[PDB]
Design a protein around this nucleic acid. Structure first.
Ligand SMILES: [Mg+2]
Ligand SMILES: [Mg+2]
Ligand SMILES: [Mg+2]
Ligand SMILES: [Mg+2]
Ligand SMILES: [Mg+2]
Ligand SMILES: [Mg+2]
Ligand SMILES: [Mg+2]
Ligand SMILES: [Mg+2]
Ligand SMILES: [Mg+2]
Ligand SMILES: [Mg+2]
Ligand SMILES: [Mg+2]
Ligand SMILES: [Mg+2]
Ligand SMILES: [Mg+2]
Ligand SMILES: [Mg+2]
Ligand SMILES: [Mg+2]
Ligand SMILES: [Mg+2]
Ligand SMILES: [Mg+2]
Ligand SMILES: [Mg+2]
Ligand SMILES: [Mg+2]
Ligand SMILES: [Mg+2]
Ligand SMILES: [Mg+2]
Ligand SMILES: [Mg+2]
Ligand SMILES: [Mg+2]
Ligand SMILES: [Mg+2]
Ligand SMILES: [Mg+2]
Ligand SMILES: [Mg+2]
Ligand SMILES: [Mg+2]
Ligand SMILES: [Mg+2]
Ligand SMILES: [Mg+2]
Lengths: 386, 63, 136
RNA sequence: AAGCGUUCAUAGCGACAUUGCUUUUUGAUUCUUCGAUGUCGGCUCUUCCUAUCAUACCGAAGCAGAAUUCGGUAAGCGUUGGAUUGUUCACCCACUAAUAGGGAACGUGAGCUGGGUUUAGACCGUCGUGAGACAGGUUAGUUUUACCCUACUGAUGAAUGUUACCGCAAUAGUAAUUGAACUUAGUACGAGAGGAACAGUUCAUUCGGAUAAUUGGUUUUUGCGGCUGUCUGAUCAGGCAUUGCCGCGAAGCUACCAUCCGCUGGAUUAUGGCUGAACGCCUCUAAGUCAGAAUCCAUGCUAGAACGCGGUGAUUUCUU
RNA sequence: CCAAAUGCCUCGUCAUCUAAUUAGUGACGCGCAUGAAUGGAUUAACGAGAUUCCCACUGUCCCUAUCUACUAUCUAGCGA
RNA sequence: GCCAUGGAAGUCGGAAUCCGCUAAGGAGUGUGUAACAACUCACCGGCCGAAUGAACUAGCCCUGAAAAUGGAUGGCGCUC
RNA sequence: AGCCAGAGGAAACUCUGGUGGAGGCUCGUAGCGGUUCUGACGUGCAAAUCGAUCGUCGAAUUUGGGUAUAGGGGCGAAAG
């Protein structure tokens, strides 16, 4: 017989299987549609999520009852040192799908990306790309042969970048290598753009800008094996329930004589690839720019790092992106920021954000001071020596 | 920007921080964090809590 | 909430489910308001309809004048005591749970309000704002 | 289709008759099960049907507007909180867009519960000489086992010359939903009473995926402070009180108790059209063809075939 | 004395209790089928008896989160 | 044409439906008008030029034709 | 209960403060039970246990030993 009481399903069937991700760097499964009139730019960037903080700004949207008033919003800051372009991959079109036809690498690879090709770096002879580097030796004719194939064929062109994780307070020592599609220009311009940027960095201000919607692509935070109450949001059973109450009472009817794929069952929670869209950029900050955290309204010569540092990450000494709200994944986690796949004109987009204040009070407690000079002025001179 | 003052501890209240309390006599109170809010709810005297600003001037410390 | 409201209300944290008894803030005669229903409340299995500041509710009178008792009348919540966040980042709350008796059209049955009134309730109900004194 | 519907069979109905469908009623049968298929209801959870309550797009009206009624495609997406009752059923209160009907061994007891029925105790009423009977009422009454196989949820993994990195995408899943308020606009419509809709904006309901700047919750941070009783001769400093207790309490986890985020292209159904014959006229239809739904397929999102595939790096001697 | 632990019809009728009551209480009584030591009516006190309502109180619930110990987990031995 | 209708003069409602002209013209088929009217039809020709209308009869096809795990002319598929 | 002192009153008589320590009284240990969780366990620690919560706790109390009653028999504050 019927349920006797209708209710919506628990959990989303399109986010299955709730299994661990294949890689800790979530892959980009779609790039924006290419219009070849614009110059050759990157379609996404790589970053390390540093943490979250607080802003104040004036809302600019008529109709709202907080129009022209100071609203408080949560932002997340991601550490984005420039990516080093070290390769290019041509993709031919085929009645089975895109297919890499060939790849060309820069003649010099840093050790931070050479480490990516090693499981045991410290024992090896470090032989990676040593014979390939002799293809530029005489005059680089063989390299020019491969680049010409990408120009002739390869209707889709993607570039290879690796992070400068040395300039980051991670213990990792090993950079993250990824493919980023090149939009703008035709195939020849895309190949020429890749060739001219070999061994050269690409700043985040050239691919991103303030007030535009970008998407986050990261693996979420792992939680291990989890029961059905916190994995699917199913009702806890009554207190009187014998042999367990954090369960699903009926896991199926008699017929079909099987457990269904759509029944909530215990398993892995978190560490799933997720792609969240429509994160407005609130600030594109710069590394060699003291007063990162200052705005037009603060003028306090302070960076974006909270007082005492970002908890579990460190200080931000490089450039950064600062998007509204929360993105998937935790601190220290490699995140891919991608430009919007469609043009958003919501009026929640298209609106210019001017920050009025950035929080730098410590996130290691109830931080009550924005800067050490502010703490010194309020609290006075202490017993601790100078 | 409007940086408030703790009604119990004389602390700077930056936007977003702590809790505002409206009493039955319609008197506003502002607490920077739940340490000061809880002490207010327990009816502790701010003049006898050694780290509050009200205590510090009552005993003329750091003059 | 419902009909009679002069505009929209940004979401306030719900703290007053059905079966809650809140104070009566007006001079209509009632001393408490027993919430039986929330106007404009959704349907979810086993979820209690819950009210917030400035919500029209349907309530009975348990303690008060006999002519107001044993009847369902509408009411507007004016104090919440459950902490809630405004869009300027401040988390605030009152001491108690207070409401005023209203009609479905939204105008107030009493002529005065005892105590502070939430700003969200005053903005959404002009007749509560008229009879209110201090607001937050 | 005799009549009803001011006139008017067929807007909406519809007598006298008559043709069916269904297996959510109850009968009827006794084919299976009596070396036992756990038995009512409720809770929990998933999925399916459509005979559609709502929501999308429509057609019709005894459709002026408004609100309704009939009907089409359509099950994509929802269909509630309570008083009484064990109740299925019922009844009322109230919210809501709506509170549609069903199925899945009358779904679901090694998932629960055990209020009922249906052991043994006991009381009443009626019946019986009696022992006792009552699909009459009342009260008390042990709810056992998974570690096997499959299924499902997650997790490894031999073989591919080795190893590493970067990728494609067959297939499978798929998700968003509904309302209010302002404006339109007291406008169209209407004699008035009343009173819309499209576009625009601001919010909200329900669901989902995350996240932890803030706020709240949690506290073996036994971190700090305090308090009781006892022990270490006192002090200092501690032990014990099965985490002694109290207040605060970072980190971590976490809440519609917090915040953020939840895409746009094509092809279509009903229907309305174009051109246009059959039928020298007409006609959305026969050949062609336009628009067009909460539909479908893609864009997008998740997984990645551990017997689908591509590109790229390095590939072992002073080593039987 | 009563729709009672006894009334089928029956969720009897009225009142009260609630927003709403097959429950509770108070009334009515041709009562299928109440009733006088097969004891009737009442009754202070008592009851791990049955039942209803109210205050207090709370994770029973809205709506679930978190912590601890012992398991479960993996390992050595043992081994149904 | 008669009533009747503020108003119906073939077309609310009743009621009749005579012959003079005639190749044809019914006080009437409808659109209709406040009402005639006007227009249209029945009918007639200086205009075409091959069959057409009504009633039915039954072959196949279609509508009637709604169920619950995904599924069954045995399967694939099949349209002179 | 009994007893002592005191107060009021015309008489009957009434009242107060102490003392005393009764009761198949009562709160509650040991003990004796075994209400509820319908908790744990439920191939157990256990063919009836464990934990909390409970009843009773100076007598119709609890209990050792001795003794009597034996199967259509016993014994039963009565449940076959
Ligand atoms: Mg249903
Ligand atoms: Mg984040
Ligand atoms: Mg923190
Ligand atoms: Mg249908
Ligand atoms: Mg069944
Ligand atoms: Mg079963
Ligand atoms: Mg069972
Ligand atoms: Mg029972
Ligand atoms: Mg697919
Ligand atoms: Mg300490
Ligand atoms: Mg001590
Ligand atoms: Mg000791
Ligand atoms: Mg001890
Ligand atoms: Mg036409
Ligand atoms: Mg994928
Ligand atoms: Mg694979
Ligand atoms: Mg009687
Ligand atoms: Mg009753
Ligand atoms: Mg009740
Ligand atoms: Mg009675
Ligand atoms: Mg076939
Ligand atoms: Mg006693
Ligand atoms: Mg006693
Ligand atoms: Mg006792
Ligand atoms: Mg005892
Ligand atoms: Mg049980
Ligand atoms: Mg038990
Ligand atoms: Mg015998
Ligand atoms: Mg005998």
């Amino acid at each position: 017989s019927h349920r006797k009481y209708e209710a919506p399903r628990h959990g989303h069937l399109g986010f299955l299987p709730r299994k661990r991700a294949a890689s800790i760097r979530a892959r980009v499964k779609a790039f924006p549609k290419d219009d070849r009139s614009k110059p050759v730019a990157l379609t996404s960037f790589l970053g390390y999520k540093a943490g979250m903080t607080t802003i104040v700004r004036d809302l600019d949207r008529p109709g709202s009852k907080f129009h022209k008033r100071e609203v408080v919003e949560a932002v997340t800051v991601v550490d984005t040192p420039p990516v080093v372009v070290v390769g290019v991959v041509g993709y031919v079109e085929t009645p089975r799908g895109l297919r890499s036809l060939t790849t060309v690498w820069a003649e010099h690879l840093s050790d931070e990306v050479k480490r990516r090709f090693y499981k045991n770096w410290y024992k090896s002879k470090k032989k990676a790309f040593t014979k390939y580097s002799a293809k530029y030796a005489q005059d680089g004719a063989g390299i020019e042969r491969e680049l010409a194939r990408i120009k002739k064929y390869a209707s889709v062109v993607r570039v290879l970048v690796h992070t400068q994780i040395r300039k980051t307070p991670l213990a990792q020592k090993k950079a993250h290598l990824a493919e980023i599609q090149l939009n703008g220009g035709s195939i020849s311009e895309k190949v020429d753009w890749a060739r001219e940027h070999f061994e050269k960095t690409v700043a985040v201000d050239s691919v991103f800008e303030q007030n535009e919607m970008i998407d986050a692509i990261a693996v979420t935070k792992g939680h291990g094996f989890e029961g059905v109450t916190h994995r699917w949001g199913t009702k806890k059973l009554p207190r009187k329930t014998h042999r367990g109450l954090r369960k699903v009472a009926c896991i199926g009817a008699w017929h079909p004589a099987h457990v269904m794929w759509s029944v909530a069952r215990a398993g892995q929670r978190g560490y799933h690839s997720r792609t969240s869209i429509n994160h407005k950029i609130y600030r594109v900050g710069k590394g060699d720019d003291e007063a990162n955290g200052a705005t037009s309204f603060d003028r306090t010569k302070k960076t974006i790092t909270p007082m005492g540092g970002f908890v579990h990450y460190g200080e931000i000494k490089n450039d950064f992106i600062m998007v509204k709200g929360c993105i998937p994944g935790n601190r220290k986690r490699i995140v891919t920021l991608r430009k919007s796949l469609y043009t958003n004109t919501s009026r929640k987009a298209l609106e210019e954000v001017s920050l009025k204040w950035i929080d730098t009070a410590s996130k290691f407690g109830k931080g009550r001071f924005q800067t050490p000079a502010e703490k010194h002025a309020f609290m006075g001179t202490l017993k601790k020596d100078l | 920007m409007k940086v408030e003052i703790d009604s119990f501890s004389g602390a700077k209240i930056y936007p977003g921080r702590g809790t505002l309390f409206v009493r039955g006599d319609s008197k506003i109170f502002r607490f920077q964090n739940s340490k000061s809010a809880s002490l207010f709810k327990q009816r502790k005297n701010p003049r006898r809590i050694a780290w509050t600003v009200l205590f510090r001037k009552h005993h003329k410390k750091g003059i | 909430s419902g009909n009679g409201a002069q505009g929209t209300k940004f979401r306030i944290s719900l703290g007053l489910p059905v079966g809650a008894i809140m104070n009566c803030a007006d001079n209509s005669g009632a001393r408490n308001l027993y919430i039986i229903a929330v106007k404009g409340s959704g349907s979810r299995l086993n979820r209690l309809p819950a009210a917030s500041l400035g919500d029209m509710v349907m309530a009975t009178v348990k303690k008060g004048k006999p002519e107001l008792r044993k009847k369902v009348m509408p009411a507007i919540v004016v104090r919440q005591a459950k902490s809630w966040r405004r869009r300027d980042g401040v988390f605030l709350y009152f001491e108690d749970n207070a409401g005023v008796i209203a009609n479905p059209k939204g105008e107030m049955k009493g002529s005065a309000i005892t105590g502070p009134v939430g700003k969200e309730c005053a903005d959404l109900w002009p007749r509560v704002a008229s009879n209110s004194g201090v607001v937050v």
